[PDB]
């Protein structure tokens, strides 16, 4: 580099550029031009009483909103020159906290001085960690109601307890209004953690929801949801997804007066009929004597518990032996395994990705090149500006068709968060996620068992398929969700552009949602082959040199002739091939590369391609608050 003064000039130039980027990023939030800074308050312990924390944190000017159960306000202070919108959510109530944690810019956790948190706080915190953490801050409540000799030890015990989830984070006190002002100063000046899924879509938190029914007997009508645009520029032609009730097109946007400016009616756009995106979930267009034989004719309540125990023994059997299936002797093996074939190698042997497709694949969409399309769409998001409403503007959305029940939920206390999608995000295809199993639950999960998916601002029920997470073209089906592996879950769902946080829940009992798997979204394609393996075992009971007579793998003579081409392998490392059947029963001669032990077992691998089951429905039951048994 040389020339000390020129090196210092280069360092000054880099300092100036990085500082300009930093100031450009920081000014967009909680200011005169940007949207309000949204904070979500989660009291992790049941001993923590949320209302006095909110009242102490309440006092600039306060504008209190009111809902059915939850009570949130909006704070406005020119001393910090900063605008806040505070909300509160109870842990365990996964619907509310998980559904408006994806819109808040900062999560404020409240902590018990004595214990770290509850089990419900841990459950909510696991869901928050896997769903995507915004900027977070830790605060504590009951420290100043204790003597000093217990106070110092209590803070040390808290510091020991928090390190297991939050390694090195400072704890702030909420005891005095001066501490509250210090905490608002801390929240106003943070390094912001940015979630990519929020930043690529155009999301909005509904501040006020109005409804005008088209026909009260039809129970549908126009919704007027008003709030601040926070993500990208909000364009009318894109569809709008309301997170609990599905995706549908919107009619009009107007910009009324921003009611609460930092320092103190006209319609913006209607949707053209041609430029609007269409509501298209799937593809629209669909001489023998009398007594002689053939041998000589050629010469001429507790039932659920029993199901749980058999599931346990099936999971235990499928862990000791990967895909071992006993052949039925009542029906023929070539009929029961009619759709199965043998692969010489799982890696190199070809398989046509379009060989035998179900009728469900005639109802989904594919991508000619998903990577290039994703990059192109993201470039028109970032590098190109649309004619919509800019971020931070208080607008009102007139959306066309929505049931009345949504409005009822907005009067219950449940928040409404609506985000406008990317192009090609309503159409359904085969989603592939990579997930790993949460240590909290150990219930066995079958491959095609119904689960609840939180996949990038969407919630839906589906029956997946679990596969090896491998870089090859074929992937072996996993008949169970294992605790330690990273697996691929395959579903039918509307397509999402990665990255996206993915949660898998199981409806346990009494309306309770139990988190079973956490992960993210891998590439979307229906050409990802999932291969189910069936392993058939036989006992070599007459052993000679390099060839043996093996039984119990088959029970007919022509089953041996049907599965003759498939190469056999061995638990002790031998590789062989069927030579001849001898008996009318399933006895066969098999050649091998070496000599077999008496304690040995021959086995054959059969393969089929399996597709997921179309059990998609966007409706998800509202959870009851979580508790431990």
């Amino acid at each position: 580099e040389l020339s000390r003064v020129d090196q210092r000039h280069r360092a000054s130039q880099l300092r100036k550029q990085k500082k300009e980027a930093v100031l450009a990023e920081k000014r967009q939030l909680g200011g005169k031009d940007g949207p309000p800074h949204q904070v979500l308050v989660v009291p992790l312990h049941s001993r923590i009483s949320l209302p006095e924390a909110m009242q102490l944190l309440q006092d600039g000017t306060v504008h209190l909103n009111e809902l059915g159960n939850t009570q949130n306000f909006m704070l406005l202070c020119p001393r910090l020159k900063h605008r806040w919108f505070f909300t509160s959510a109870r842990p365990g109530d996964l619907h509310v906290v998980l559904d408006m944690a994806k819109v808040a810019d900062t999560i404020l956790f409240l902590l018990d001085p004595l214990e770290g948190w509850d089990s419900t706080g841990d459950y909510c915190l696991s869901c928050l960690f896997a769903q995507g953490l915004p900027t977070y801050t830790l605060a504590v409540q009951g420290i100043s109601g204790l003597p000093l000799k217990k106070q110092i030890d209590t803070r040390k015990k808290l510091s020991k307890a928090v390190e297991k989830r939050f390694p090195h984070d400072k704890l702030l006190l909420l005891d005095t209004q001066q501490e509250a002002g210090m905490l608002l100063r801390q929240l106003a000046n943070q390094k912001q953690q940015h979630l990519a899924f929020r930043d690529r879509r155009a999301y909005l938190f509904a501040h006020a929801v109005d409804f005008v029914p088209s026909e009260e007997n039809n129970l549908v009508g126009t919704l007027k949801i008003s709030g601040y645009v926070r993500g990208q520029t909000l364009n009318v032609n894109r569809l709008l997804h309301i997170v609990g009730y599905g995706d549908f097109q919107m009619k009009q946007i107007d910009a009324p007066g921003d009611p609460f400016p930092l320092n103190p009616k006209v319609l913006m756009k209607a949707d053209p009929g041609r430029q609007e995106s269409l509501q298209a979930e799937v593809i629209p267009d669909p001489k023998v004597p009398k007594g002689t034989s053939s041998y000589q004719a050629e010469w001429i309540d507790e039932e659920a518990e029993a199901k749980m125990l058999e599931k346990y023994k099936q999971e235990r059997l499928e862990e000791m032996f990967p895909d071992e299936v006993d052949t039925p002797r009542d029906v023929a093996a070539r009929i029961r395994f009619q759709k199965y074939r043998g692969l010489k190698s799982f890696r190199t042997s070809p398989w046509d990705p379009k060989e035998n497709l179900p009728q469900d694949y005639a109802r989904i969409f594919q991508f000619q090149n998903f990577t290039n399309t994703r990059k192109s769409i993201f470039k028109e998001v970032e590098e190109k500006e649309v004619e919509g409403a800019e971020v931070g503007w208080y607008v009102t959305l007139h959306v066309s068709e929505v049931p009345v029940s949504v409005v009822e939920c907005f009067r219950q206390g449940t928040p409404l968060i609506a985000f406008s999608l990317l192009p090609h995000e309503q159409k359904m295809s085969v989603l592939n996620m990579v997930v790993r199993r949460d240590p909290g639950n150990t219930e066995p999960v079958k491959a095609k068992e119904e689960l609840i998916f939180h996949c990038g601002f969407r919630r839906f029920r589906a029956s997946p398929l679990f596969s090896q997470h491998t870089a090859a073209d074929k992937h072996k089906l996993q008949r169970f969700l294992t605790a330690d592996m990273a697996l691929v879950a395959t579903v039918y769902a509307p397509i999402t552009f990665p990255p996206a946080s993915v949660l898998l829940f199981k409806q346990k009992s009494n309306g309770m949602h139990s988190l079973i798997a956490t992960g993210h979204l891998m590439s979307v394609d229906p050409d990802r082959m999932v291969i189910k393996r069936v392993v058939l075992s036989g006992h070599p009971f007459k052993i000679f040199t390099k060839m043996a007579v093996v039984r119990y793998m088959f029970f007919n003579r022509e089953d041996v002739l049907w599965f003759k081409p498939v190469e056999l392998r061995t638990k002790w490392g031998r590789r062989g091939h069927i030579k001849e059947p001898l008996g009318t029963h399933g006895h066969m001669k098999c050649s091998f590369d070496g000599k077999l032990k008496s304690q040995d077992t021959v086995l054959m691998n059969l393969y089929k391609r399996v597709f997921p089951k179309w059990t998609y429905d966007p409706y998800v039951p509202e959870p009851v608050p979580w508790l431990k048994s």
Binding site: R341, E355, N356, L357, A362, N369, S376, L561, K564
Partner: peptide, 18 residues
Amino acid sequence: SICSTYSNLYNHPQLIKY
């Protein structure tokens, strides 16, 4: 009639062009 099949090419999903 052992490990032989026809397996015709049918009902492909509609692909989105780039």
